[PDB]
């Protein structure tokens, strides 16, 4: 029947839920297209996965994404990692993962952060951060 | 015998005591072949109070943080009117319960 797979991507506080669906080759996030949604200097790193792999491998697949929480730079990394999971999981489950295996191998040899998340947060000390106050007298 | 789609809520400080109460309540009801919608568990709210330890003020300045936690875990049901009185018996101590007919 209908073909669709669901994957998510995470950052510090940037959660991006995405459904990768059988389509005809269009990709856009939050409904609005990809053409703009980034700071203008960083938009190349949006193109990372599609550019290295070739657009021909995005022939007939549709994707819709929703992202919220965090900050600007956090969100952009979140959504690109969702792209990788979307394409790899749909192909693995519905076509031969042999192509996936070259895809996955080639994709992570360039950069591993495409499929794995980076865990990093903060912690409450009693000094104003990790540095104490100025000594009253010494 | 007109149903009213009641909802029953619970409150407690403990967690393991309340949780086992929730399972036994659902199974005590289910044994007489009644339909039940499962255990909707409300989020746990955490409230803190920070105070200084020393009572006067000399020496270094050090704090401590006490905490308390609360759980809700309310339940709903579709049932006739007065079967509730027979079934809600045999509750623990401390645990509070409020019933909402939601008519």
């Amino acid at each position: 029947s209908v073909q669709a797979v669901q994957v998510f991507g995470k950052k510090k506080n940037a959660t991006a839920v995405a459904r990768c669906v059988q389509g005809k080759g269009l990709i856009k996030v939050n409904g609005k297209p990809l053409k703009l949604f980034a700071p203008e200097i960083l938009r190349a790193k949006l193109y990372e996965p599609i550019l290295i792999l070739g657009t021909d491998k995005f022939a007939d697949v549709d994707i819709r994404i929703r992202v919220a929480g965090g900050g600007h730079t956090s969100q952009v990394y979140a959504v690109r990692q969702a792209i990788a999971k979307s394409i790899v999981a749909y192909y693995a489950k519905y076509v031969d993962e042999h192509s996936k295996n070259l895809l996955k191998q080639e994709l992570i040899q360039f950069d591993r952060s495409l499929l794995v998340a980076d865990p990093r947060r903060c912690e409450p000390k009693k000094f104003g951060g990790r540095g104490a106050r100025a000594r009253f007298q010494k | 015998p007109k149903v009213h789609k009641i909802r029953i809520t619970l409150t407690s400080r403990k967690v393991q005591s309340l949780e086992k109460v929730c399972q036994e309540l659902i199974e005590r009801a289910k044994n007489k072949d009644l339909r039940v919608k499962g255990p909707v568990r409300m989020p746990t709210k955490t409230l803190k109070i920070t105070t200084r330890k020393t009572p006067c003020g000399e020496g270094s300045k050090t704090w401590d943080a006490y905490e308390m936690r609360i759980h809700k875990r309310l339940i709903d049901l579709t049932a006739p009117t007065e079967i509730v009185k027979q079934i809600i018996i045999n509750i623990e101590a401390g645990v509070e319960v409020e019933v909402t007919i939601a008519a």
Binding site: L34, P39, I41, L42, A44, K45, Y77 | -
Partner: protein
């Protein structure tokens, strides 16, 4: 039409930062290879790497990120590499437009020339200098060069109508040869001279 139509030529070419391919890097000398890494290229330096976690994990890193990080300092410029990455890429265009050579060639050959080989360490002599003029490692060379280079650009541009982009641009092109009008090379040359004295 998912991707922008104009930027299409690159796909049929090896990976590059649009305007410049990293292919055909300098052949000038040795002893700084294995410590400048370009063999795995990147488009933009904004990669959140965990280089700090270990000793030499920060040795395996494209030099392009190093320059961007070094530029942001002095309180106001803390964590705002976006201006830094802006300036470096834009400054590359200036020197490319001012000289037919590849800007990566401009940055690489400059940094390999502006590093000292011997220095002096302050061992206790009871107020005096037993400075034996010790040697320097290749890794520290690039570390001190980048740091002192970027400081030269900001101090010059400070309180001037000129901007850092062309100031940094002029700094690299003067350091190509012994111009002596560059912050880096002037302070670089004295270091061996005082070191050569206590040799």
């Amino acid at each position: 039409d998912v991707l922008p139509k104009e930027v299409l030529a690159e796909v049929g070419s090896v990976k590059l930062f649009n305007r410049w391919s990293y292919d055909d890097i300098e052949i000038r000398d040795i002893s700084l290879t294995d410590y400048i890494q370009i063999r795995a290229p990147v488009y933009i330096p904004h990669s959140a790497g965990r280089y700090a976690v270990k000793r030499f994990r920060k040795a395996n890193c494209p030099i392009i990120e190093r320059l961007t990080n070094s530029l942001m300092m002095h309180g106001r410029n803390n964590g705002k590499k976006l201006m830094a990455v802006r300036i470096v890429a834009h400054a590359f265009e200036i020197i490319h437009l001012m000289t037919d050579q590849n800007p990566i060639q401009v940055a690489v050959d400059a940094i390999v020339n502006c590093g000292p080989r011997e220095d002096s360490t302050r061992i206790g002599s009871a107020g005096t200098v037993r400075r034996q003029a010790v040697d320097v490692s290749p890794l520290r060379r690039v570390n001190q060069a980048i740091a002192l280079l970027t400081t030269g650009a900001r101090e010059a541009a400070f309180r001037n109508v000129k901007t850092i982009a062309e100031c940094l641009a002029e700094e690299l092109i003067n350091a190509a040869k012994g111009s002596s009008n560059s912050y880096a090379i002037k302070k670089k040359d004295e270091l061996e001279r005082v070191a050569k004295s206590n040799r």
